[PDB]
């Protein structure tokens, strides 16, 4: 979800230009600060990528530096976050050209991403979605579980000893956490670049509301305003980190992963296509150019019957695709 | 100070386009929340106006809502800040099209302002400034003093009773505070609109570093990078709220108003012109279109001799223009 603003300028051919901007933030764990920065930047860019815009013109970095650390610790942490944020901006072929850092009792890492585009250079997230369309997800789910288990290694909770220790090893937790953070810092840029090519009908990114929450918002957005559609996103199968699923079952689905509401940070794109043929071709080209990272067809869009505010559903007995 | 980013688009005539963006924030006092919002927005726009860009394409609002207040108080405060912020955006002929609100122990009100412009639609803040140029300031100084005296009426400090009470009345303090907040919520938009018309050589806005701090940064900026100039901004006379000056003298210049380092929020533009004739014409047209708000010629630019990092100075025995 971005802001899309018509400008009082056209391009060289007299075509309308638009300023597309987005902002986001995340609360980092006590962890590798360079990595925090990378995830912070990928999270900001993710929203722009969901508009089918692979080229970001510039970024602003917004950072809250914690008053808890001593000067030495705070200085190196801030420096490393900045470096990691900038490293992802370089990978995105953009630059960080401004922003601000403030002292604050709680840390925060976020920013703003902006692109100036013509209509031909984006894919609008409303107005294209139809019943029958096929849904694909470009990153696996379960990062909230991953981050919390890793946290418990350095600063344990009673739940860790009660339900986790002895059943899921520090090595399996290390591997889950590495898979999750590797996935989180990855850009959705290649996905954005391929959306138009395969006739995508729009996308949303998956962040703090979980797969089902963001699916719901994507569906609900089609019901505003002047030319509404009444649609329901049906999730039939979902890619989830295997160890995150195992951990969830040991903790009575504490983080609501299996319910569809577990928070992701810098999650994947949930993209719609007009057919399975189109969706499969997008997935095939995406894995081939983006380092062999799989994507998954996860369901379809149907006509909405229905309960107020409900525009997405998890199918009863949906398939879990263990990753 | 903004970010100015060349875009891979031209306008209808094949002229280069640039994305100019800026961000800023302020820590609001316990006060009228609608007014907090208005000052917050004017503060964000001020930086864009300093680039001679009177038309803002869009704004994002970034707000930190305090965890200190109870739900009822927080909800109405947040609502009123939002309304005040939006009211100034309407006055600026722009819209707030996105942003974010976060819970936080400390309140903050800020945002982002963006414009897409050609070279002909802005005035760059480096590269035009010359020795001999005349400096003008478009809002009076002393808001930090004003805000703190008003604060002491509802939540007193020992300094208030020691040095203020009995010498500066609650009515004089009310008047100083009203003058200061009236000035702070005013947009620098008309100033921006008139800069090019009179051949301005760039501007900076005046915010948290005080008149001398921002003058210094404006001068120092000319020394980077490929085509540097060595210049010194000389401040010869300064407009200051009369009561703020009186209060300063009672408190041994506590807030450094007389030293030139008192923090302003949403202060005026410090603008350079090639001559006194040009400067006077700008001032005359600005007061005529912007509700009769005075502006002042405050000094000039000279060749820099000098101490490292020093690119501005207050003249010994400079004139205080009481407002």
């Amino acid at each position: 979800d971005c802001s899309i603003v018509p400008l009082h300028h056209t391009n060289s051919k007299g075509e309308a230009l638009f300023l597309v901007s987005t902002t986001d933030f995340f609360f980092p764990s006590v962890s590798d600060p360079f990595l925090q920065g990378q995830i912070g930047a990928a999270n900001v860019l993710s929203d722009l990528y969901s508009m089918g815009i692979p080229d970001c013109d510039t970024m602003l970095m917004l950072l809250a530096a914690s008053t808890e650390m001593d000067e030495h610790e705070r200085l190196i942490t801030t420096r490393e976050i900045m470096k990691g944020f900038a490293e992802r901006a370089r990978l995105a072929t953009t630059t960080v050209t401004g922003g601000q850092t403030v002292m604050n009792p709680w840390p925060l890492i976020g920013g703003v991403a902006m692109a100036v585009v013509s209509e031909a250079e984006m894919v609008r997230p409303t107005g294209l979605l139809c019943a029958g369309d096929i849904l694909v997800l470009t990153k696996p789910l379960g990062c909230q579980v991953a981050v919390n288990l890793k946290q418990w290694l350095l600063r344990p909770s009673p739940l860790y000893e009660e339900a986790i220790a002895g059943h899921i090893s520090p090595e399996e937790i290390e591997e889950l956490y590495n898979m999750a953070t590797d996935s989180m810092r990855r850009l959705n840029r290649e996905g954005a670049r391929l959306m138009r090519k395969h006739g995508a009908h729009g996308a949303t990114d998956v962040t703090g509301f979980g797969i089902l929450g963001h699916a719901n918002n994507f569906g609900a957005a089609q019901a505003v305003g002047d030319a509404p559609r009444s649609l329901c996103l049906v999730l039939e199968r979902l890619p989830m980190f295997k160890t995150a699923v195992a951990a969830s079952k040991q903790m009575n689905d504490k983080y609501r992963l299996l319910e569809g509401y577990s928070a992701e940070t810098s999650g994947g794109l949930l993209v719609a296509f007009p057919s399975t043929t189109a969706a499969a071709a997008f997935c095939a080209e995406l894995t081939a150019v983006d380092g062999g990272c799989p994507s998954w067809i996860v369901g379809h869009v149907e006509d909405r019957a229905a309960v107020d505010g409900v525009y997405a559903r998890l199918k009863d007995g949906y398939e879990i695709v263990e990753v």
Side-chain angles (χ1 to χ4, degrees), chain A residues 1-67 69-153 156-160 163-307 309-323:
Chain A
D1 178 80
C2 309
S3 145
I4 306 159
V5 174
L7 299 164
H8 301 259
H9 276 300
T10 56
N11 63 19
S12 60
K13 302 160 259 296
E15 298 162 349
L17 287 178
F18 297 84
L19 172 62
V20 178
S21 56
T22 182
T23 191
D24 207 355
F25 296 87
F26 93 113
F27 202 108
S29 35
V30 45
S31 44
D32 174 344
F34 184 91
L35 175 63
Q36 289 179 11
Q38 293 182 294
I39 292 166
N43 192 49
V44 165
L45 289 161
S46 183
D47 295 323
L48 185 64
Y49 293 150
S50 77
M51 306 270 325
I53 298 173
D55 301 328
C56 174
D57 287 299
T58 203
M59 299 187 77
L60 304 179
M61 183 181 56
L62 297 171
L63 174 57
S66 183
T67 49
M69 320 181 167
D70 57 40
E71 194 175 56
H72 177 62
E73 181 185 356
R74 176 180 50 88
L75 270 36
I76 61 99
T77 297
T78 298
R79 181 178 69 218
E80 295 306 308
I81 293 166
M82 291 180 68
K83 292 180 172 178
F85 200 99
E87 183 274 341
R88 292 287 96 169
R90 288 195 307 273
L91 181 65
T93 319
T94 194
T95 57
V96 179
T97 54
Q100 220 151 333
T101 296
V102 301
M103 300 302 298
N104 192 255
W106 301 351
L108 247 318
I109 303 178
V112 185
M114 294 156 276
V116 173
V117 293
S118 63
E119 286 279 1
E121 290 168 334
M122 61 176 156
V123 179
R124 287 181 183 259
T126 59
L128 304 168
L129 198 55
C130 304
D133 284 2
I134 302 306
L135 297 173
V136 349
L137 179 60
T138 67
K139 295 184 181 185
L141 304 170
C143 298
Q144 184 177 33
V145 183
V147 167
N148 280 288
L149 297 173
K150 181 60 166 60
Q151 182 67 221
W152 296 342
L153 294 188
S157 69
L159 190 56
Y160 172 73
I164 306 300
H167 303 141
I168 304 180
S169 80
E171 292 74 40
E172 290 172 294
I173 290 177
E174 193 82 25
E175 182 180 323
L176 170 58
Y177 182 78
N178 288 337
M179 293 283 187
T181 65
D182 278 354
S183 183
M184 296 157 68
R185 67 178 177 189
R186 285 179 188 125
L187 302 180
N188 284 324
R189 181 182 197 194
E190 292 307 323
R193 185 171 300 273
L194 293 173
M195 282 172 61
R196 274 202 76 100
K197 185 173 185 173
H198 296 281
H201 287 176
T204 183
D205 69 327
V206 181
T207 318
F209 299 139
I211 183 60
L212 178 54
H214 292 275
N216 198 76
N217 297 342
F218 190 21
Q222 316 304 315
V224 348
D226 269 347
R229 287 201 177 88
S230 199
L231 297 169
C232 182
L233 278 71
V234 184
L235 303 174
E236 306 177 80
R237 68 196 283 268
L238 291 177
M240 294 180 180
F241 294 118
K242 182 184 179 180
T243 301
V245 172
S248 287
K249 292 182 180 179
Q250 289 296 108
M251 306 172 299
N252 291 336
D253 201 25
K254 183 185 204 298
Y255 297 101
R256 299 212 283 179
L257 179 58
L258 307 181
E259 182 173 347
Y261 293 119
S262 181
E264 309 292 330
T265 292
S266 191
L269 299 181
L270 180 62
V271 195
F273 294 93
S275 60
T276 295
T277 299
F282 169 91
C283 289
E285 190 174 0
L286 178 55
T287 174
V289 309
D290 205 10
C293 287
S295 57
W296 298 264
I297 293 181
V298 300
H300 69 275
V301 184
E302 71 183 5
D303 286 321
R304 183 171 183 266
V307 179
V310 177
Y311 295 83
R313 64 186 179 87
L314 270 179
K315 191 180 64 181
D316 287 340
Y318 69 91
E319 177 189 15
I320 292 178
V321 179
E322 299 188 327
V323 168

